[PDB]
Amino acid sequence: TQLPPAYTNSFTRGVYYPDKVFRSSVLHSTQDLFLPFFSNVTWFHFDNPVLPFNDGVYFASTEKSNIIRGWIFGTTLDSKTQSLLIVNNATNVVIKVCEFQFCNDPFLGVESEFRVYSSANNCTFEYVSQPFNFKNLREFVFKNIDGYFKIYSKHTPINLVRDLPQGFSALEPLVDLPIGINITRFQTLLALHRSAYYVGYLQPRTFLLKYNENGTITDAVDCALDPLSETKCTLKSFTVEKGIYQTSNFRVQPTESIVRFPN
Amino acid sequence: VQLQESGGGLVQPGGSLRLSCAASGFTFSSYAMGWYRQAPGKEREWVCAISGSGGSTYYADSVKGRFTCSRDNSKNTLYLQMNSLKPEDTAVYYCARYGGPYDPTDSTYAFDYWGQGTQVTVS
Amino acid sequence: VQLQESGGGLVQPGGSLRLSCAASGFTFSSYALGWYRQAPGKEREWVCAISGSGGSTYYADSVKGRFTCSRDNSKNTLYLQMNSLKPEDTAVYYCARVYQFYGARDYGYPYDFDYWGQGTQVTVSS
Amino acid sequence: RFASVYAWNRKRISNCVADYSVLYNSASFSTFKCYGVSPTKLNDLCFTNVYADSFVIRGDEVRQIAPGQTGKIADYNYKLPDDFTGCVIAWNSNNLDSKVGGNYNYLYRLFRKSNLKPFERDISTEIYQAGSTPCNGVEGFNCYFPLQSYGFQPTNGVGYQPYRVVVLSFELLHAPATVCGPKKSTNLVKNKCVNFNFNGLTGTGVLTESNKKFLPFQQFGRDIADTTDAVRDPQTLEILDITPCS
Ligand SMILES: *[C@@H]1O[C@H](CO)[C@@H](O)[C@H](O)[C@H]1NC(C)=O
């Protein structure tokens, strides 16, 4: 089964709490790495490719069958340098960092088989959790900032087979792991079925976030999305009165360089 | 986790004895192990040593040539084939494991795990 | 810091002699000092050690009672009196400075030292 | 069980809170010497990794586990870097390791081809040829078996008793530090002008019970001008309002 590439839009998803500060009934303008609104998001589904990490990754899935179970993050994934393995084994959740020699087709199945990697190495640390259409939307944001691997997430009930549902919900911080390695690529680990995910990238962006009375982010404006969004951002309001507002500066960019000296 | 020694016995001068010992788990595989002896009136001294993965064996001056020491890596069992015994050879024999390489999991790689003692008598 | 040598001698068995070794060097300031015993046929033996800042003193089993180990911190001199010297106790006696010797109970024996005694021959004549 | 000095045991201590004042204050350590660190500096400074190294060695050899020192153990059994940061802790084990007749279970190396590198461990049993003639098996002609046993008697000289030694090596990498000392907390004081420090957030003000609710991951809040307005106590999960002192 050979599948084509496919893409969709991010709509208003990919916003997360940038900090642990409580705010109430205010609009807060912040600059951080965020998935742009309506950004092109790659749609995968027989698919376990290795993808770049870039600045950070927005990952989402729409599943009812518990097929997507984990991620591999690292620079090379070839046992020469350290990589972070985060896997839900349907027993516990294991997070460990090692110079693993990864398989060229890692997968899980039923649990009846665990491959993922061949050889292992001296891990810096290991964490193991306590033992334990589509109906479940799981959203994650993965960032590598100053040696710390930060994960934000949300679980939203859904009823949609073909695409991400539209709406707005902010992701909450999940973990802040002291990893200390460079991450340039990652791979998604899925279980084999026995008796559908979206990947986008974060970019430096300024957002005006709306906090409700209880400190929950209920809406946001992506300042670079549209002149109307720029107007909303400069006025620190989601309601703009009739009138003319100066929001930016039109600058012609150079495209070529000229170096001239006498012959 | 533990080592248990066996074999031993009483022989006449010129006879032979097959001594052996074994250990549970990853004690012998990928580790060196050897033999020591202690005469009833003497301190314990080294007899021989064999590298489990290597397979070569070194012997003491009183051991080399006269008798040999071997191993089985699949059964993690150490053997000593003693021959040409003399009254001076009466002693309690022990086998022990040398410390090994670092093992990232919960392990006792650095410990020696000395055995109980196998009595060999010549008379 | 510098060492010194004073005393020694030949005595009759059952007699006694005095030992000591003045403290030398401008950097000496109540550091623990002690007495080392060496002979061609014997293992290195520690006779005693005194803590300059407290007076706590370590003695070897063959030294306790028989010999008196003391130090005068005003004169910065280390003194030991070799009372009732036995033929079995003949050796060269050296004056060393103890780096450390007592962080725990059931202890006092010196761990580390730096400069060894030059030469003090203590003998007997039966 | 402690490992022999030749094959010493290295326990990697990471991702934890390291209580060091208890080790210094605890009784019966025959020696506790710190190189580059101090008991008044530990229990505070954060490190990336801590490596504990445990060996059983004769009392006379304790002086050899230190930076800048030489000797048979320092050179062939456990070489410590001269540029060493950490503490060497040791205590008498005469009532643990000694056995009637002598405890010969602990081994040390006397014969080695070259000096051991700092923190390098060796588990080799290869025969030392001493630079003379081929061995082809150890024999009494300038050819020696590298490992010898100790004779730890119940009654012996203090310098000949077994001692257990633990060396705590402190390692700083570019990774975020994970091993920190314990933090100390004070009692919470309300309705007074008090200088406070909640985690890393400091200030002066009056703490009162708040009627605001914060999400489980939010630790403090701010007002309309980004001035801290309330904090969630690190131990009691309640919201406290901060009123400026008049
Ligand atoms: C600390 O322990 C006390 C014990 O009563 C408990 O009430 C409190 O919730 C604990 N704090 C945290 C942050 O777990």
Residue numbers in the entry:
A (entry chain B): 22 to 66, 79 to 143, 154 to 175, 185 to 247, 264 to 331
B (entry chain D), C (entry chain H): 2 to 52, 52A, 53 to 82, 82A, 82B, 82C, 83 to 100, 100A, ...
D (entry chain A): 346 to 591
What did the study's authors say about this model?
Here, we describe the production and validation of a discovery library that produces single-domain nanobodies using an engineered human antibody variable gene segment. As a test case, anti-SARS-CoV-2 nanobodies were isolated from this library and pairs of complementary nanobodies were incorporated into an antibody-like molecule that targets the receptor-binding domain using a biparatopic mode of engagement. To understand the structural integrity and epitope propensity of our engineered nanobodies, we determined atomic structures of a selection of our lead nanobodies (LM18, Nb-C2-136, Nb-C4-225, Nb-C4-240, and Nb-C4-255) in complex with SARS-CoV-2 RBD (X-ray crystallography) and SARS-CoV-2 S protein (cryo-electron microscopy). Our structures reveal that these nanobodies adopt a VHH fold as expected.
The cryo-EM structure of the LM18/Nb-C2-136/ bsNb4-Ig in complex with trimeric S protein helped elucidate the mode of binding that facilitated the high binding affinity and potent neutralization. The structure shows LM18 and Nb-C2-136 binding to the same RBD in the up conformation with two of the three RBDs bound on the S protein. Consistent with the binding data and our molecular clamp hypothesis, it appears that the LM18 and Nb-C2-136 nanobodies are linked to the same CH1/CL domain. A small amount of density is observed in the EM map, and modeling suggests that the CH1/CL domain can adopt an ensemble of conformations with the 12 AA linkers that connect the nanobodies to the CH1/CL domain. No density is visible for the Fc domain; however, the orientation of the CH1/CL domains is compatible with a single bsNb4-Ig using both arms to engage the two up RBDs on S protein. An atomic model of LM18 and Nb-C2-136 was generated using focused classification and local refinement methods on a single RBD in the cryo-EM data. LM18 binds an epitope between the class 1 (CC12.1) and class 4 (CR3022) binding sites in a manner that is predicted to sterically clash with and compete with these two antibodies. Similar to the class 4 nanobodies, approximately 88% of the buried surface area is contributed by CDRH3. Nb-C2-136 binds on the opposite face of the RBD in a region that would sterically clash with class 2 antibodies (e.g., CC6.30). Unlike the other nanobodies, two CDRs are involved with binding to RBD, with CDRH2 and CDRH3 contributing approximately 30% and 50%, respectively, to the buried surface area.
